[PDB]
């Protein structure tokens, strides 16, 4: 019943020519609702979900202005970081930023975050108390000192506990039809002989939302991890997710195995067993 709003920002430098590639995406729980791609023609923050289209021109003009300001900040950061790390201007580098807020079932502030990374590694991150910073190395250290003097945390904290939560609640309300609905996974099992003596049982969970889910195999009532395979949760492409768990068993012994599916959309977990 808990929820969250998140923004992801990626900027990749292009030393050979031009400015960094900049891509921003916004999410409410597991639903992307906005996006900006410096490579796009519009040069505008664009809607990705129907319920955000309700927003008027002032909203789109404002989000566009701010997302562009973000891209420019990343542009400067790539330069600054290149200096901090005493790196050549010849190579392409990456900066990433993510921030957001979480609310509980009562839609009250639960926690906020703001993290940054350079070339795929942690650079600096706001502590959960939203009062301090976690700097990974000395380059981040100087950034940390700079941000303490400018009181960046104080400003972020107000956003995370104020505007962030306030708009998350607005979105959840405007997109209630999908955002406040859970899609329980559609489950079934498939049988795939691997030899005349062994067979693979695959337990499928499909078209579910949100993405969080747990698939577990049990053999005669007890969890089994050996001879099992769990693929990472993946998007179906229509807003929902998929996942499957498999176990190799001796042919003829299929009935000993059960697949257990846990998901927020299920009152109680589901149990599947091969016919």
């Amino acid at each position: 019943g808990s929820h969250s709003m998140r923004y992801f920002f990626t900027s990749v430098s292009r030393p050979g020519r031009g400015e960094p590639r900049f891509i921003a995406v916004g999410y409410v729980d597991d639903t992307q609702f906005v996006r900006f791609d410096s490579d796009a023609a519009s040069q505008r923050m664009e809607p990705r979900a129907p319920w955000i289209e309700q927003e008027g021109p002032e909203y789109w003009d404002g989000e566009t202005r701010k997302v562009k300001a973000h891209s420019q900040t990343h542009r400067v950061d790539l330069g600054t970081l290149r200096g901090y790390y005493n790196q050549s201007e010849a190579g392409s580098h990456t900066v990433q930023r993510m921030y957001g807020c979480d609310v509980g079932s009562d839609w009250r502030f639960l926690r906020g975050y703001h993290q940054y990374a350079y070339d795929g590694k942690d650079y600096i991150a706001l502590k959960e108390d939203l009062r301090s910073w976690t700097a990974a190395d000395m380059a981040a250290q100087t950034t940390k000192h700079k941000w303490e003097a400018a009181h960046v945390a104080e400003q972020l904290r107000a956003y995370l506990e104020g505007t962030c939560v306030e708009w998350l609640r607005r979105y959840l309300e405007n997109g209630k039809e999908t955002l406040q609905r859970t899609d329980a996974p559609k489950t079934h099992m498939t049988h795939h002989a691997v030899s005349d003596h062994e067979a693979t049982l695959r337990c499928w969970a499909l078209s579910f939302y949100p993405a969080e889910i747990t698939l577990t195999w049990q053999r005669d009532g007890e969890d089994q991890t050996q001879d099992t395979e769990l693929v990472e949760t993946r998007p179906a492409g229509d807003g929902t997710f998929q996942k499957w768990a498999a176990v190799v068993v001796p042919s003829g012994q299929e009935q000993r195995y059960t697949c257990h599916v846990q998901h927020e959309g299920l009152p109680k977990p589901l149990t599947l067993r091969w016919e």
């Binding site: 923004y7 900040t73 400067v76 600054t80 600096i124 956003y159 962030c164």
Partner: peptide, 9 residues
């Protein structure tokens, strides 16, 4: 809704 400002590193 995005954060209004963004300080550089």
């Amino acid at each position: 809704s995005l954060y209004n400002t963004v300080a550089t590193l």
